[PDB]
């Protein structure tokens, strides 16, 4: 077996919103996982002070969106391998073996298994396609609105079915680290 990628539940984190509400703001393209830059117009934001915006008109808003691993991902994660009761594409999840046909590395599909991809749990070269987009804020105080499809890891968890330890025929128990029958 060789390791293509690992996947787990992604953590939705948003940097703090820039409003310099007289002149335009410029963002920078970053190598973050599923990094997105958008600029937004007139919101005239409020904080607890209630007045953070000189030039009540002319407003510009900056917001960024990216995903990164949830802090529990060193335990609750799935490993995708390619390798007989084993199919050509197998999925390892906490000692349970599933013969899922996961998408290839670089071919991310939102709302499905393997929507976020990285080589290791500590790897910084994370790629993701979660179909995240930014919406125009309408309420008078400051916030970021965003809509996004659900985690395909949790949806695949729901429809995983039985693992290969009860699926593989000829009465043999699948054992993990390394994969074997």
């Amino acid at each position: 077996t060789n390791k293509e990628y690992v996947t787990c539940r992604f953590h939705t984190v948003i940097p703090s919103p820039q409003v310099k509400c007289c002149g335009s703001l410029e963002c920078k393209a970053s190598s973050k996982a599923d990094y997105t830059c958008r600029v937004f117009g007139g919101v005239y934001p409020f904080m607890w002070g209630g007045a953070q915006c000189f030039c009540d008109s002319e407003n510009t808003q900056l917001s960024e969106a990216y995903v990164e691993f949830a802090p529990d991902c060193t335990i609750d994660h799935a490993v995708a391998l390619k390798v007989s009761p084993f199919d050509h594409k197998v999925v390892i999840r906490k000692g349970l073996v599933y013969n899922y046909d996961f998408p290839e590395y670089g071919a991310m599909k939102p709302g499905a298994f393997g929507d976020i991809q990285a080589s290791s749990l500590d790897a910084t070269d994370i790629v993701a396609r979660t179909d995240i987009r930014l919406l125009k804020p309408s309420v008078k105080n400051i916030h970021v609105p965003y809509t996004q499809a659900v985690s395909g890891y949790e949806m695949w968890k729901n429809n995983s079915g039985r693992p290969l330890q009860e699926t593989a025929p000829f009465g043999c128990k699948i054992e993990v680290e390394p994969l074997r029958a």
Partner: antibody
Amino acid sequence: EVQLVESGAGLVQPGGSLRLSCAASGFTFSDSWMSWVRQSPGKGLEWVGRIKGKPDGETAAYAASVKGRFSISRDDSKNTLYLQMNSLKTEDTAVYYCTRDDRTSCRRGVCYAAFHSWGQGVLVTVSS
Amino acid sequence: DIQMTQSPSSLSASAGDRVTLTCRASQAISFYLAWYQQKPGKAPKRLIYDASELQGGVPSRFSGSGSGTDFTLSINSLQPEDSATYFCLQYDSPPFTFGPGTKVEIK
């Protein structure tokens, strides 16, 4: 306010070369996208080319009819925009503009920018 | 190349009435349309970028909305220094194409 001034245009021989200048001032020059705008008498507005910033590598895109003949050469020491055009055809007699592009969205890395600033425009005549 | 259409081309009106101007895009641009206008003998000026929100430097009577292939340019009051030729630009893929324009005049 972003100041963009054009100079260096005039009456030239067809099938030759010249060098005009767009001295950019009023912004951070090392991280802004520059584009050029061409206007025809009797037709609409035409795009020429785009260049990127210093972390991108100063690469240059171009239109369909200007590939291999136009050369944009920027320099950060004196903050001006140059255009080395060669093989002046009969369809290049126009009024040119130099523009500043601020980026509005960088969806998964690639950045898409509109046309934010503009110059006063100078006219070039390619005839005999 | 992405083709720009500009309909209509002659929408002369009076002050304070209802004028709606559109710019159809051919392929499925998400919201990347920028709205311009042109004084005669002057430089162009941008009005609305990202097709929904108002740029700083312009009054609040200009507004736009739309996504996909149909967009609008809603004018609240035709104050008589709005006599210009409105332009629309896509900035999604090269080459960036301008519309032919609409000569709106006020008499």
